Enzyme design. Structure first.
Site, PDB file in Angstrom:
ATOM      1  N   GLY A 149       0.817  -1.195   0.000  1.00  0.00           N
ATOM      2  CA  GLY A 149       0.000   0.000   0.000  1.00  0.00           C
ATOM      3  C   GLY A 149       0.854   1.250   0.000  1.00  0.00           C
ATOM      4  N   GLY A 207       0.400  -4.501   1.027  1.00  0.00           N
ATOM      5  CA  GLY A 207      -0.873  -4.519   0.325  1.00  0.00           C
ATOM      6  C   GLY A 207      -0.954  -5.634  -0.698  1.00  0.00           C
ATOM      7  N   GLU A 246       6.290  -4.345   7.886  1.00  0.00           N
ATOM      8  CA  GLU A 246       5.616  -3.240   8.559  1.00  0.00           C
ATOM      9  C   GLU A 246       6.274  -2.855   9.875  1.00  0.00           C
ATOM     10  OE1 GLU A 246       3.514  -6.105   7.720  1.00  0.00           O
ATOM     11  OE2 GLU A 246       3.437  -5.231   5.708  1.00  0.00           O
ATOM     12  N   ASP A 282      -1.365  -5.415   8.483  1.00  0.00           N
ATOM     13  CA  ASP A 282      -2.675  -4.976   8.036  1.00  0.00           C
ATOM     14  C   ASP A 282      -3.199  -5.913   6.944  1.00  0.00           C
ATOM     15  OD1 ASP A 282      -0.549  -3.863   6.378  1.00  0.00           O
ATOM     16  OD2 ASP A 282      -2.130  -2.720   5.374  1.00  0.00           O
TER      17      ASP A 282
END
Ligand SMILES: [K+]
Ligand SMILES: [K+]
Ligand SMILES: [K+]
Ligand SMILES: [K+]
Ligand SMILES: [K+]
Ligand SMILES: [K+]
Ligand SMILES: [K+]
Ligand SMILES: [K+]
Ligand SMILES: [Mg+2]
Ligand SMILES: [Mg+2]
Ligand SMILES: [Mg+2]
Ligand SMILES: [Mg+2]
Ligand SMILES: [Mg+2]
Ligand SMILES: [Mg+2]
Ligand SMILES: [Mg+2]
Ligand SMILES: [Mg+2]
Ligand SMILES: [Mg+2]
Ligand SMILES: [Mg+2]
Ligand SMILES: [Mg+2]
Ligand SMILES: [Mg+2]
Ligand SMILES: [Mg+2]
Ligand SMILES: [Mg+2]
Ligand SMILES: [Mg+2]
Ligand SMILES: [Mg+2]
Ligand SMILES: [Mg+2]
Ligand SMILES: [Mg+2]
Ligand SMILES: [Mg+2]
Ligand SMILES: [Mg+2]
Ligand SMILES: [Mg+2]
Ligand SMILES: [Mg+2]
Ligand SMILES: [Mg+2]
Lengths: 49, 66, 467, 64, 102, 53, 237, 154, 123
Positions: free
Chosen positions: C67, C116, C139, C147
């Site tokens: 992302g 993502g 992350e 996520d």
RNA sequence: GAGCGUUAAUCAUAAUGGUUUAAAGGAUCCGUAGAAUGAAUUAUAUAUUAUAAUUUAGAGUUAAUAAAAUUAAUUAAAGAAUU
RNA sequence: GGAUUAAAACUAGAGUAGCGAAACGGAUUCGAUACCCGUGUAGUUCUAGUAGUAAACUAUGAAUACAAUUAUUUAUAUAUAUAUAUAUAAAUAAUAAAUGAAAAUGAAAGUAUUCCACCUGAAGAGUACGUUAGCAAUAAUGAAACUCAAAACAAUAGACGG
RNA sequence: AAUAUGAAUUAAUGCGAAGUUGAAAUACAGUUACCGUAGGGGAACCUGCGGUGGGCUUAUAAAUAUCUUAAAUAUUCUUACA
């Protein structure tokens, strides 16, 4: 388009006719004792006796 | 031989080399796996599988396959 | 006038979605996510689309490098928190749509699939890997959390050393990159197909259609998709050796085995007090080093989510990720460093790790607040055409390599059968390679079964016992 | 002759299709050399073992 | 053989098919239209279950070749709405049928 | 679809194009002229064997 | 031949038989074929690269890409006739696979004609098992032959030890001569040593040839005599 | 040029019969609009600009220097052993051009043979040109446009 | 033919039956006077003595008319009415005389199809 | 059916045609009219057309380089044989 | 509209070996105004003209865009470990597809577009009449009546064949 | 001068039956047929000149062939060996 909704009302516009449900409703107000029976738009012709 | 090419097989050909067409083995493998699964399915379902080959020397392979 | 960020095309009865941001490694912004989310709802209503194919136009360089969080960091620095919450509502809503999508989705993970990108594939039962696949969840180094529903997927799909989410915690907390065949053997990828064969596979996917009076949403068609992909799978490289040895799998299974109220310190204790082989002891020190270069707050939040989204349904796990992301961009209690760390690494190129300041141990209440919806900020996931929730993926198990818990179930069942027979390793291999219809001839299935029996089972006489 | 009878009789067929052979005459073509006994016996062997596994799975489900 | 039928009464659209010397021009018809076609075509339509059809035969009117040509036309010259929709990735709506739907 | 079908040559591009085309025509004329002179030289070398008197 | 339709649609034709009731019982293959659909496109597919040499197929060099003068000294200012002919056929013609090694192979056997007399087995064992380190010429599993030289030459040019192919080839050739000389001596000496310890051999290669030549020369003697007697009678005429 | 359009319609029919997956057509505005409508209607798998030798992988600006070598590359579709684009014919011919008012276009789409034009069939595409733009007949009727009935694709 | 050739006259020939009684001048029938009664021989494979008559019509055209029915009383100078219709086996006889009109009586003792032979209904 | 038949007439009943071999390619080419047909981009207009500008893929011009010695007309010669 | 247009034929002036309508003879035959033989005139040749006709045929008008293969030559170009190899065109042959009444066509007799010529049952008839052109033979243009339900093509199986 | 009518007078042609003199065509039709043109003859037809195939593409051999471990080893082999 593959995901375009097309329903009775859209078909009616394509065929240039009132929706079929409307036709059924207008045919139910024809009875002399049925609701909606109306006839006055024609009382506009000058007559002399 | 490229002289005997049936052009309807064009999509299976990898290229030509030494006066012959080279078959694309990547496609052969995918087609073979699909064909093998069909044989397995029919065998597992109890169907009659007939192996036909009439070139000299094929009998031994054909008999064991059956 | 500019090239669209995501390109949509027709492949017979298959609809191809291609990520088209090559210069950004196909990073996902709000625009891309919104476009894909809307077009997938239309394809769900269509009766001419049988399956969807999510690929990139940059392969083999990358599928999706993650992302677009660098832009979200600038928003935080500019107090554009509404923009940031829009970016996460779109992305997480797209991840929820893919997870619950009723038609087969086939993701081609031909390249870097990090962040993502993992959300685009982890939620599909048909996630194909290649030699160029590079799966990672980096992350912890940026100050964010795992996520895109990775705290609901990884604890449920990993194959080895994941009885108590030990391997899931290892990947999420260390940010280890897994490559190609290893991703397939761990369960990160459902299939392993050579990149050269992706063109042919795409054509075959477009040509197959549900037979007779079966819709593409029926389980029957899902089996057909699985078979089609299998025809393009090829045997693993002869020299290939699994990345993690049994000893390295023993360190993860023990050092990351926490309770329902565990803490990152407990993992640090195990990694610091581990005993065993020299390789295992050295391996535990390597993990300890890595875990000490991460964000002290992110590691605690990640552990919280894994221990919370490993027993909850999909919708509540994805919703809890939206709350956490929003509660991190808006750092009300100055407990995280997501924005500052993101600028240190992405906006500004700095190889050195960001010097961390929030090095305390958040309490159970503090973690609850960071992962719970604030009554002042109302955020909800966009509605999809399925609107369904469930605690277990409906198809992932059938079409991936079996987990260590499924092999155990068959050994226990077989060992407790009225037959009074002995469970033998050979019988275990046969039962998983030549019995289950959806797993018949599955690549690297016998190798995985032998890794499990050699590390989890005790061979006494002509039988096997589940140590 | 056999292929046309199979079509007329709605019998699915598998065949090795060499570069001079018509693919559309069979349900499941296998592109490959059909002149060498090694190539033919290699492909036949694979198909034969696939059938054997199907047979063994059918006889196994009957036992249990 | 099975022949596609639109609403199990007629053909899909119009057909202009050439079988050897026979030129077949077949047109689909409204419900209740009946069979208004060559006598050979009439008998085939009766057996096949076609109720509404219009058509004209040009050039050769050899009975044998009309019958075979008709059978060939009904199979090789027709495409169902479903087959057209799937091939083009589009939705095809019968406006007359939608007009009388709920 | 939005891209223009044709982009006209800029005045500068037309100038460079004309230079190359003029050069091409001039070089070919020069090379033919020099070839003719080299043939006239090789004919002078042998004209001592030719008879005019 | 026309693209056939009836071989790949057996399932659909069968399904019509079952739906109507003409066929009462579902065939055993029916479910299997339904789950594994046949491929029915039978299309010609374009190709944009030669897999052997990586040459790009279907690329036209525009005049803007040829700004400098050519070998004749002229600039290119307009497309030529070849550039203006559609080249779709090249996309569909199976590419001719070429290899640099083929050029060296022809050279090696032109320089060493008698290497052809060493029998070669074309039957493969298992191509996937070949684990060769071409830092050296000898390999376990394969004979010493011309191919050993070619593969050694390629390794040298691939490792950039030599720049010119000729220099790498000459270097490999000498390594080949050394190995060939050690084998010619091992065989001569082994024969000599065996005879010195009482080894006996029935027929030598030279003897084998003499016997075969005698068999042929005996039939030839008969025919010559016969045909030198028919001539005498026929000529007498 | 209607002649060029006639050449292209015949070319697509020839390519469909042999089942080539990719072919080229002349590079002109009319051809591009024609191809684009077919692509949006699902008759063509792909539409790429290119050269005489093949489709361009990277954008190549078209100029007078290379205009003569430009081509449009289109991908044909085949499903269930049948070509998706089976027939492609002109309605308005070079020697007899047909201009219809919107009222007559509505009759053509309603089953009425207008000026010998057979009416629109199920699953058929009829294209109309109005002010040098090509659109489906149903779209011209929606925009109340009068235009030349160019061709019918099935 | 090309579109311009059609513009210049090219087209399908028209189909319309042609007159087989040109001597009547597009009239249902014409009166005439018998010039000579004759007996003619059918063309093969027919054999009979077919009764015909040469007639001069009121418009000056002279025609050969077949006398239908069994037996006739037609002579020279008899007034007859001639209608269209040829005698197939007699070439050149393209007309019929009407029985029961003028001086030609109806067929004697005709029972069936009387209207075609000028026979009145028996009481 | 108080009409029926018959004759005389009109419309319909296949060009959603053909021309190697069945009716039908002009001996051949050149070229005039054509109220015949015919490239590309852009801008206007009153719009499948017109105008203007621009372009080179059809059609041409001139060279350069290579190749070939035929086809017309004319003139000058040769050859075997025949009578 | 114009030009060119085999053989025969015609108008002038040359030429005339051989061939050869006709004619006159010899044979053959029941007859032989023929086939064969002889003598052999026009013609066949050249120069200058007239005429514009042939199974003047590929019995297939011209142009353009396009579609699957092979073989064989030719041409141009490219390369070299120099004589082959690789390319792109043309021609020819055999074909796929397609077309077709079929025989077959095969880059058109396929898929399309543009322009010209021409056809509309047989026979009568390419005749009659008129007209135009020509020294002439003739050439072009070109009907109708009467009569008939025929007439024609490809292919099939036979029968027959000095 | 045109149109119409009759017309001495005169030309071409069809059908019908039906023999006569020959045997021209269809097979190598017993001289390959036919096209153009010229001459000749009771009649079909014959002959000259060029053209066409809608007749010969109907097309089908001057023959000659070779050496490596014949087996304690290849030939057997049933998911085994590795
Ligand atoms: K024809
Ligand atoms: K003219
Ligand atoms: K003479
Ligand atoms: K000819
Ligand atoms: K013409
Ligand atoms: K004769
Ligand atoms: K003649
Ligand atoms: K003659
Ligand atoms: Mg073969
Ligand atoms: Mg009445
Ligand atoms: Mg009509
Ligand atoms: Mg024609
Ligand atoms: Mg001609
Ligand atoms: Mg002619
Ligand atoms: Mg040019
Ligand atoms: Mg004279
Ligand atoms: Mg004589
Ligand atoms: Mg003249
Ligand atoms: Mg004449
Ligand atoms: Mg003529
Ligand atoms: Mg000629
Ligand atoms: Mg020309
Ligand atoms: Mg005349
Ligand atoms: Mg015939
Ligand atoms: Mg005779
Ligand atoms: Mg005769
Ligand atoms: Mg004769
Ligand atoms: Mg004579
Ligand atoms: Mg002659
Ligand atoms: Mg003959
Ligand atoms: Mg013949």
């Amino acid at each position: 388009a593959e995901s375009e909704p097309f329903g009775p009302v859209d078909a009616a516009h394509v065929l240039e006719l009132e929706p079929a449900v409307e036709t059924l409703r207008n045919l139910s107000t024809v009875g002399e004792h049925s609701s909606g029976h109306q006839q006055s738009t024609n009382k506009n012709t000058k007559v002399i006796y | 031989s490229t002289s005997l090419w049936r052009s309807s097989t064009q999509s299976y050909i990898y290229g030509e080399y030494k006066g012959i067409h080279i078959i694309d083995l990547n496609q052969t493998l995918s087609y073979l796996k699909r064909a093998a699964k069909v044989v397995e399915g029919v065998s597992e379902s109890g169907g009659i599988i007939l192996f036909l080959g009439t070139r000299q020397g094929q009998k031994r392979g054909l008999e064991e396959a059956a | 006038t500019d090239a669209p960020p995501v390109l949509f095309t027709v492949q017979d009865t298959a609809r191809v979605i291609t990520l088209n941001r090559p210069k950004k490694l196909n990073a996902l912004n709000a625009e891309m996510s919104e476009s894909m989310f809307k077009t997938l709802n239309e394809y769900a209503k269509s009766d001419t689309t049988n399956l969807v194919i999510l690929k990139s136009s940059n392969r083999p360089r990358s599928f999706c490098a993650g992302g677009d969080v660098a832009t979200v960091a600038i928003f935080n620095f500019n107090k554009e928190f509404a923009k940031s919450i829009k970016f996460f509502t779109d992305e997480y809503s797209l991840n929820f749509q893919i997870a619950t999508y009723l038609k087969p989705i086939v993701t081609f993970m031909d390249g870097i699939t990090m962040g993502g990108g993992v959300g685009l594939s982890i939620h599909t039962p048909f996630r194909i890997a290649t030699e160029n696949t590079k799966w990672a969840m980096p992350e912890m180094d940026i100050g964010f959390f795992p996520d895109v529903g990775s705290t609901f997927a990884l604890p449920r799909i990993v194959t080895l050393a994941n009885s108590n989410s030990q391997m899931a915690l290892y990947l999420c907390l260390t940010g280890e990159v897994v490559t190609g065949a290893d991703a397939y053997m761990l369960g990160l990828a459902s299939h392993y197909v050579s990149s050269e064969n992706l063109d042919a596979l795409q054509k075959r996917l477009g040509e197959i259609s549900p037979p007779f009076n079966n819709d593409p949403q029926s389980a029957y068609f899902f089996g057909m998709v699985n078979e089609s992909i299998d025809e393009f799978v090829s045997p693993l490289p002869k020299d290939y050796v699994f990345k993690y040895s049994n000893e390295k799998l023993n360190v993860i299974e023990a050092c990351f085995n926490l309770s329902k109220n565990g803490t990152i310190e407990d993992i640090m204790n195990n990694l610091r007090q581990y005993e065993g082989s020299a390789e295992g002891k050295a391996f535990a020190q390597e993990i300890k080093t890595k875990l000490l270069t991460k964000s002290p707050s992110s590691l605690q939040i990640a552990l919280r989510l894994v221990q919370e989204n490993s027993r909850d349904h999909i919708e509540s796990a994805i919703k809890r990720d939206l709350y956490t992301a929003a509660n991190m961009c808006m750092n009300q209690d100055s407990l995280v460093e997501f924005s500052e760390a993101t600028k240190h690494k992405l906006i500004d190129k700095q190889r050195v790790p960001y010097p961390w300041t929030k090095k305390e141990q958040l309490f159970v209440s503090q973690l609850t607040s960071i992962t719970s919806p604030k009554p002042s900020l109302p955020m909800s996931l966009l509605r999809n055409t399925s609107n369904v929730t469930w605690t277990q993926y409906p198809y992932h198990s059938k079409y991936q390599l079996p987990t260590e818990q499924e092999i155990a179930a068959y050994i226990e069942k077989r060992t407790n059968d009225d037959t009074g027979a002995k469970v033998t390793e050979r019988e275990v291999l046969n039962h998983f390679a030549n019995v289950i219809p959806s797993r018949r001839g599955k690549l690297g299935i016998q190798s995985l079964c032998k890794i499990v029996c050699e590390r989890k089972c005790e061979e006494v006489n002509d039988g096997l016992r589940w140590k | 002759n056999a292929l046309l009878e199979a079509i007329k009789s709605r019998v699915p067929t598998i065949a090795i299709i060499d570069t001079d052979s018509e693919p559309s005459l069979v349900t499941y073509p296998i592109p490959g050399n059909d002149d060498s006994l090694r190539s033919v016996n290699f492909l036949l062997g694979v198909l034969a073992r696939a059938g054997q596994r199907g047979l063994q799975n059918r006889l196994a489900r009957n036992n249990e | 053989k099975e022949i596609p039928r639109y609403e199990n009464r007629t053909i899909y659209g119009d057909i202009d098919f050439r079988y050897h010397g026979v030129k077949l021009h077949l047109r689909s018809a409204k419900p209740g239209f009946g069979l208004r076609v060559n006598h050979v075509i009439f008998e085939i339509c009766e057996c096949a279950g076609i109720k509404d059809l219009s058509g004209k035969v040009y050039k050769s009117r050899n009975d044998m070749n009309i019958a075979k040509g008709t059978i060939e036309a009904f199979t090789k010259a027709q495409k169902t709405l479903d087959e057209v929709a799937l091939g083009r990735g589009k939705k095809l709506v019968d406006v007359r049928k939608v007009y009388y739907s709920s | 679809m939005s891209q223009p079908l044709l982009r006209n040559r800029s005045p500068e591009e037309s100038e460079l194009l004309k230079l190359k085309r003029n050069y091409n025509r001039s070089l070919l004329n020069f090379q033919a002229h020099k070839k003719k002179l080299n043939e006239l030289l090789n004919l002078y070398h042998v004209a001592n064997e030719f008879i005019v008197t | 031949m026309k693209i056939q339709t009836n071989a790949v649609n057996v399932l659909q034709r069968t399904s019509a038989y079952l739906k109507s009731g003409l066929l009462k019982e579902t065939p055993a293959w029916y479910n299997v074929v339904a789950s594994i659909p046949p491929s029915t496109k039978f299309t010609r597919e374009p190709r944009f690269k030669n897999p052997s040499n990586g040459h790009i197929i279907g690329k036209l060099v525009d005049v803007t890409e040829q700004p400098h003068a050519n070998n004749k000294g002229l600039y290119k200012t307009r497309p030529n006739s070849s550039d203006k002919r559609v080249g779709v056929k090249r996309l569909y013609r199976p590419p001719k696979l070429t290899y640099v090694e083929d050029r060296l192979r022809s050279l090696f056997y032109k320089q060493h004609p008698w290497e052809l007399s060493r029998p070669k087995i074309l039957v493969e064992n298992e191509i996937g098992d070949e684990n060769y380190d071409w830092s050296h010429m000898l390999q376990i599993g394969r004979p010493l032959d011309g191919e050993s030289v070619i593969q050694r030459t390629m390794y040298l040019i691939k490792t950039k030890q030599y720049g010119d192919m000729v220099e790498a080839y000459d270097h490999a050739r000498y390594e080949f001569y050394a190995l060939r000389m050690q084998e010619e001596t091992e065989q001569q000496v082994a024969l000599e040593e065996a005879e010195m310890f009482g080894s006996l051999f029935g027929v030598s290669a030279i003897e084998h040839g003499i016997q075969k030549e005698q068999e042929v020369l005996d039939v030839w003697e008969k025919k010559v005599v016969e045909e030198t007697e028919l001539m005498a009678a026929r000529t007498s005429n | 040029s209607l002649v060029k359009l006639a050449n292209t319609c015949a070319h697509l029919q020839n390519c469909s019969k042999v089942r080539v997956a990719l072919t080229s057509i002349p590079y002109t505005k009319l051809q591009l609009q024609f191809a684009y409508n077919l692509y949006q209607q699902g008759f063509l798998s792909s539409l790429q600009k290119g050269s005489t030798m093949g489709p361009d992988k990277d954008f190549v600006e078209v100029t007078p220097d290379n205009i003569s070598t430009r081509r449009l590359w289109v991908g044909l579709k085949y499903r269930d052993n049948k070509p998706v684009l089976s027939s492609c014919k002109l309605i308005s011919k070079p020697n007899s051009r047909i201009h219809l008012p919107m009222e007559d276009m509505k009759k053509l789409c309603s089953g009425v043979t207008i000026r010998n034009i057979k009416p629109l069939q199920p699953g058929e595409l009829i294209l109309v040109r109005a002010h040098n733009n090509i659109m489906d007949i149903n779209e011209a009727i929606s925009k109340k446009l009068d235009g030349e009935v160019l061709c019918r694709v099935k | 033919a090309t579109l311009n050739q059609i513009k210049r006259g090219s087209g399908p020939p028209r189909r319309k039956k042609i007159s087989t009684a040109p001597q009547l001048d597009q009239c249902p029938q014409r009166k005439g006077v018998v010039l000579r009664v004759m007996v003619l021989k059918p063309k093969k494979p027919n054999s009979a003595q077919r009764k015909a008559c040469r007639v001069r019509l009121t418009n000056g055209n002279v025609v050969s008319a077949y006398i239908p029915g069994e037996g006739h009383d037609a002579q020279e100078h008899s007034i007859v009415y001639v209608r269209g219709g040829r005698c197939q086996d007699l070439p050149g006889v393209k007309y019929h005389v009407i029985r029961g009109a003028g001086d030609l009586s109806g067929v004697v003792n005709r029972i069936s199809s009387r209207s075609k032979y000028g026979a009145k209904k028996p009481s």
